[PDB]
Scaffold this active site. Structure first.
Site, short mmCIF file in Angstrom:
data_model
loop_
_atom_site.label_atom_id
_atom_site.label_comp_id
_atom_site.label_asym_id
_atom_site.label_seq_id
_atom_site.Cartn_x
_atom_site.Cartn_y
_atom_site.Cartn_z
CB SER A 1 -12.01 8.95 -2.17
OG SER A 1 -11.74 7.75 -2.83
CD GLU B 1 -3.11 -0.82 0.18
OE1 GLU B 1 -3.00 0.10 -0.65
OE2 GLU B 1 -4.05 -1.61 0.14
CG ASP C 1 -13.93 7.16 -5.38
OD1 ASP C 1 -12.84 7.64 -5.12
OD2 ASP C 1 -14.61 6.65 -4.52
CG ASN D 1 -8.83 6.04 -4.11
OD1 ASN D 1 -7.85 5.33 -4.37
ND2 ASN D 1 -9.26 6.29 -2.84
CG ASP E 1 -6.52 4.95 -1.07
OD1 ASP E 1 -7.74 5.06 -0.74
OD2 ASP E 1 -6.12 4.08 -1.85
CG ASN F 1 -11.11 5.32 0.01
OD1 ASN F 1 -10.99 6.46 -0.29
ND2 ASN F 1 -11.62 4.40 -0.83
NA NA Z 1 -4.71 1.13 -2.43
#
Ligand code: NA
Ligand code: NA
Length: 129
Positions: free
Chosen positions: A50, A35, A48, A46, A52, A59
């Site tokens: 958003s 990650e 959408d 992201n 992370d 998120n």
């Molecule tokens: Na991720």
């Protein structure tokens, strides 16, 4: 902060993630590797809109407020920047809520695609724990 592999294992174990909802410590270390590369300051957008945040790429769509993710929730009740601290408490406490929410560690796409089904214990080999 960029954690060492065994350093993060130890912090995660001290914060109660070893076998939390049955996910052995190596699952968590594996997830953090793919990650964030163990970097608390990691941020990624992201599709959408958003974002992370932090060592476990938590998120803003559901879990934290970053002031720019419309129609999102803040289920951990934290600003997303708290997830970027050198101290991992807020990420770990939030991860505990996430993992408990029905889908276990599948909530982390990197976990499901790179750790699940693999010998995750390798991630803690050599570590004093
Ligand atoms: Na991720
Ligand atoms: Na589960």
């Amino acid at each position: 902060k960029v954690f060492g592999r065994c350093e993060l294992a130890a912090a995660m174990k001290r914060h109660g993630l070893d076998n939390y909802r049955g996910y052995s410590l190596g699952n968590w270390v594996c997830a953090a590797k793919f990650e964030s590369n163990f970097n608390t300051q990691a941020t990624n957008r992201n599709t959408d809109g958003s974002t992370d945040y932090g060592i476990l790429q938590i998120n803003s769509r559901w879990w934290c407020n970053d002031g720019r993710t419309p129609g999102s929730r803040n289920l951990c009740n934290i600003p997303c920047s708290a997830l970027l601290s050198s101290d991992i408490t807020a990420s770990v406490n939030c991860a505990k809520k996430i993992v408990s929410d029905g889908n276990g560690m599948n909530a982390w796409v990197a976990w499901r695609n790179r750790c699940k089904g693999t010998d995750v214990q390798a991630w803690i080999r050599g570590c004093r724990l």
